[PDB]
Design a binder for this molecule. Structure first.
Ligand SMILES: Nc1nc2c(ncn2[C@@H]2O[C@H](COP(=O)(O)OP(=O)(O)OP(=O)(O)O)[C@@H](O)[C@H]2O)c(=O)[nH]1
Ligand SMILES: Nc1ncnc2c1ncn2[C@@H]1O[C@H](COP(=O)(O)OP(=O)(O)OP(=O)(O)O)C[C@H]1O
Ligand SMILES: [Mg+2]
Ligand SMILES: [Zn+2]
Lengths: 86, 99, 97, 50, 76, 89, 48, 122, 166, 34
RNA sequence: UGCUC
């Protein structure tokens, strides 16, 4: 008959097989660097819309100095339907 | 005997009794006779107010033995019940606060 | 309990509930079947809709959305049994107003 | 009932609102007639008709 | 103004119960009771005197509502 | 009329009762408890507390009877009281 | 000094939303894992 | 117990002083034993805030003076926070406006300070 | 100091019906929001006024009078740049312990921006010479119940000169 | 001990089919229901 | 199971 267990099995049981190490070479490193560059450059892209901040505490003279300025891309309204114009 | 039919739709309650019936034409149609024995067991919680303060004082002074009376007192501040069979019932009657 | 030898109380069967409904006495029916029989105060979490304990929801590991609620004990037993059957009743509470 | 050994139940409400609702809606004087056809059920019986 | 001007038995019962509970909870009396130790009797006296400060809020099935005073309604 | 308000004569049996009513708790309490409960769990049908049986089960005053309406207190008050004026604004 | 937190609210249940729980939600809801098939101990106290 | 807007409208210390005085007089005119025993933190906070506002120069203020000061500062294109601070502090010295008051660069002009002092002192 | 709009369901028992509804509502709201800090709002002082007060219901339960009241209340919540005047109610090695006058002992100015002669040797020494001013910097709140304070804020003391007191 | 008077005269006296441990000096109901 | 109604 099967024996009784006093404590539950470990949350992460150990395994004798480990993951195969990653492939090495200039190609993999270049792809990694390019993916990191894409991560870094695609957040500042106008397509990356951020959450509109709201509930400003007060208005100040330094506003014009701290006013975030960023160019906005103009969608082609010819291809896009009319329901998306502001 | 399921939960819906046995414990939700119809369930047992307290403050109730079951007794045999007998005829008595001397009572009104809207009146029913209750025995003293059952009357001393089924209790009703009355709130001490400015109107029935003296009646409840007298009921507490009577005690659980005499038919007109009470069995337990629950204070307004603390919810610790007090049994009237023990202790000085007069001191409890004199200290009946509103509520 | 059921029997007199067991110090049991009377039973308001389904027909008694039907009569009370026909009379329309809602408060009397509530006091009989809820207040004086199996009244209890449970703690329900307004986020997941599950039952908590001592003002704490072990599911979400929080206590800000936990609120007290009056309920018949048989109804809580039914909810627990249904949760045991994988039928999870999610309670969405709201103000009485 | 026929007073031949029948056991009847007697319940005591534990709330003023329930008490008032029982006295008003379930009052004996307010239910002298049945809702089936309006005929009066609470009337004279044997030893009263004779 | 479109509902029945008569005060139903259910409204009577609920108003009497609420007033009895309030009086049992140390509420002021507006009829100068004369040795009435039962709150329900005081509530019935206030109803017969038409001095219960309660306004019924009758709700229509669609959602509309209307207020009716106890002294404004008709009792039987 | 209750048997002929959906355009079809529906009987009082469990089938017609299910076709007419919508509350899950009432159908589960009447007949076919496990079947109806599992069907509702699968459909995820949210059941309201508008019916009478569910009000009795959950321990809340039923909508029928004295609970159809609400009561208001005739307290001495003044709706929309005067507001303190703002000096700085 | 002291934070404002509501003591009790007159919450009224609106409706019951039936559904199902995934094994992960079952693990999250549960507190302990039952793995012993026996009920009581070997000692004479027979503690669980 | 939710809030709709935590920054609905800013108010100076004079409004708070008037509200505290009104609450204090209504309390001493309608003092209740059980209501006071239930929560005594109200009395403490009210009295201590009133004493704090009394320690400040907030006294000798009236709605007409506040309106006149606001109308006088409206011509100085100053922000609401600056005038709020000037009214709550009532600076008698110039250094208080030169350095302590924020947004000093390009706003003092070395000539408007005299007008600000004459207005706040009047 | 700033006004805050709130909506509260106030429950008045039946033994307060002889009193005016508005006065009782104001008293209850003051008793419920006295010396308490509402999260992300600040420490409420007292009730300013009551704007909207709709019908008063009576539930079939407790039987009391429940009223949904919209009101405006005053709360102490700087705007991250307000200037205050407090008194030094102690001092610690890592930072002085200044408190607004009998208002709240929660202002903990960090000593990391004054001229480079800043240190506290536990003898209540404020600062080596070359009514205490305070410049609020940031607000911060935290919860309390986490098992079956809340307002400190940072204070700034720049080179204000202070010709009156060093 | 009794929570009100602090006495130790706690007796288990069933009052009409109601098991109740109550103080025997002042009558403060210590525990009730089983 | 026996009953009581
Ligand atoms: N003396 C006695 N006999 C009983 C009782 N209940 C059932 N029986 C007998 O057992 C037979 C029916 O058994 P059930 O009543 O179905 O037993 P059960 O309800 O499955 O048993 P439990 O689930 O343990 O209550 C009948 O022929 C009865 O004679 C009882 O309470 N007392
Ligand atoms: N199985 C049962 N279900 C419901 N009620 C019952 C049952 N058995 C008895 N009763 C109660 O007893 C009453 C039956 O009496 P009834 O049949 O009218 O007279 P009887 O027993 O024929 O007497 P006679 O033989 O005519 O002298 C009515 C009912 O309330
Ligand atoms: Mg018979
Ligand atoms: Zn949760």
């Amino acid at each position: 008959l099967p024996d009784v267990v006093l404590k539950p099995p470990p949350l992460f049981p150990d395994t004798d097989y480990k993951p195969v190490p990653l492939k090495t070479g200039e190609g993999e490193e270049y792809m990694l660097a390019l993916k990191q560059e894409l991560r870094e450059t695609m957040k500042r892209m106008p397509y990356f819309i951020e959450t509109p901040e709201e509930r400003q505490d007060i208005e100040r003279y330094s506003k014009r100095y701290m006013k975030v300025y960023k160019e906005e891309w103009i969608p082609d309204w010819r291809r896009l339907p009319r329901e998306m114009m502001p | 005997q399921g939960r819906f039919r046995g414990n939700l739709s119809g369930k047992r309650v307290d403050f109730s009794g079951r007794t045999v019936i007998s005829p008595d034409p001397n009572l009104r149609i809207d009146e029913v006779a209750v025995p003293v024995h059952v009357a001393k067991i089924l209790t009703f919680p009355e709130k001490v107010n400015k109107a029935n303060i003296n009646f409840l004082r007298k009921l507490v002074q009577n005690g659980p033995e005499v038919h007109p009376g009470a069995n337990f007192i629950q204070q307004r501040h603390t919810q610790m019940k007090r049994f009237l069979k023990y202790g000085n019932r007069e001191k409890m009657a004199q200290e009946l606060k509103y509520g | 309990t059921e029997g007199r030898s067991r110090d049991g109380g009377l039973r308001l069967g389904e027909m008694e509930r039907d009569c009370l409904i026909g009379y329309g006495a809602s408060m009397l029916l509530l006091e009989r079947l809820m207040i004086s029989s199996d009244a209890f105060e449970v703690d329900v979490c307004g986020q997941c809709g599950l039952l908590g304990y001592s003002g704490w929801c072990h599911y979400c590991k929080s206590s800000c959305h936990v609120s007290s609620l009056r309920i018949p004990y048989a109804c809580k037993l039914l909810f627990q049994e249904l949760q045991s059957m994988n039928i999870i009743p999610r309670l969405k509470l709201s103000k009485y107003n | 009932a026929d007073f031949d050994g029948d056991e009847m139940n007697l319940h005591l409400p534990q709330t003023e609102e329930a008490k008032a609702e029982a006295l008003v809606l379930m009052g004996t004087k307010a239910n002298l007639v049945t809702p089936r056809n309006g005929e009066p059920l609470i009337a004279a019986i044997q030893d009263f008709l004779t | 103004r479109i509902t029945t001007p008569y005060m139903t038995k259910y409204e009577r019962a609920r108003v009497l119960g609420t007033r009895a509970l309030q009086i049992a909870m140390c509420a002021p009396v507006m009829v100068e009771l004369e040795g009435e130790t039962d709150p329900l009797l005081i509530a019935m006296k206030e109803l017969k005197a038409r001095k219960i400060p309660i306004i019924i809020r009758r709700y229509l099935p669609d959602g509309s509502y209307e207020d009716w005073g106890v002294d404004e309604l008709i009792i039987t | 009329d209750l048997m002929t308000y959906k355009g079809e004569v529906l009987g009082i049996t469990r089938f017609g009762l299910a076709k007419m009513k919508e509350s899950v708790l009432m159908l589960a309490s009447f007949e076919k408890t496990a079947d109806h409960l599992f069907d509702a769990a699968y459909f995820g049908q949210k059941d309201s507390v508008c019916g009478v049986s569910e009000c009795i089960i959950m321990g809340i005053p039923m909508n029928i009877g004295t609970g159809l309406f609400k009561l208001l207190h005739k307290a001495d008050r003044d709706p929309n009281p005067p507001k303190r004026p703002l000096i700085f604004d | 000094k002291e934070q404002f937190r509501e003591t009790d609210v007159a919450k009224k249940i609106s409706h019951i939303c039936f559904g199902m729980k995934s094994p992960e939600e079952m693990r999250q809801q549960a507190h302990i894992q039952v793995v012993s098939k026996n009920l009581y101990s070997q000692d004479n106290q027979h503690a669980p | 117990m939710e809030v709709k807007d935590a920054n609905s409208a800013l108010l100076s210390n004079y409004e708070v002083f008037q509200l505290l005085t009104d609450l204090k007089e209504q309390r001493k005119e309608s003092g209740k034993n059980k209501h006071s025993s239930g929560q005594q933190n109200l009395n403490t906070i009210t009295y201590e805030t009133l004493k704090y506002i009394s320690k400040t120069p907030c006294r000798h203020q009236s709605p007409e003076i506040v309106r006149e000061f606001l109308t006088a500062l409206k011509s100085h294109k100053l922000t609401k926070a600056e005038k709020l601070q000037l009214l709550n502090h009532r600076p008698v010295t110039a250094v208080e406006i030169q350095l302590m008051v924020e947004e000093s660069e390009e706003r003092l002009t070395e000539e408007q300070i005299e007008a600000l002092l004459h207005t706040v002192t009047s | 100091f700033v006004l805050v709009e709130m909506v509260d369901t106030v429950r008045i028992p039946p033994w307060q019906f002889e009193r005016k509804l508005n006065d009782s509502i104001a008293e209850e709201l003051n008793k419920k929001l006295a010396n308490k800090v509402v999260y992300n709002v600040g420490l409420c002082i007292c009730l300013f006024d009551i704007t909207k007060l709709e019908d008063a219901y009576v539930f079939p339960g407790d039987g009391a009078s429940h009223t949904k009241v919209h009101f405006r209340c005053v709360v102490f919540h700087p705007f991250l740049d307000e200037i205050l005047i407090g008194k030094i109610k102690g001092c610690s090695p890592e930072g002085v312990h200044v408190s607004l006058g009998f208002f709240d002992d929660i202002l903990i100015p960090p000593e990391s921006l004054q001229q480079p002669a800043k240190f506290d040797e536990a003898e209540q020494v404020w600062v080596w010479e070359y009514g205490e001013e305070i410049r609020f910097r940031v607000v911060d709140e935290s919860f309390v119940d986490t098992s079956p304070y809340t307002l400190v804020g940072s204070i700034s003391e720049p080179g204000l000169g202070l010709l009156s007191w060093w | 001990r009794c929570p009100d008077c602090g006495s130790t005269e706690l007796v288990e006296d069933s009052h009409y089919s109601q098991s109740q441990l109550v103080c025997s000096d002042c009558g403060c109901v210590v525990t009730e229901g089983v």
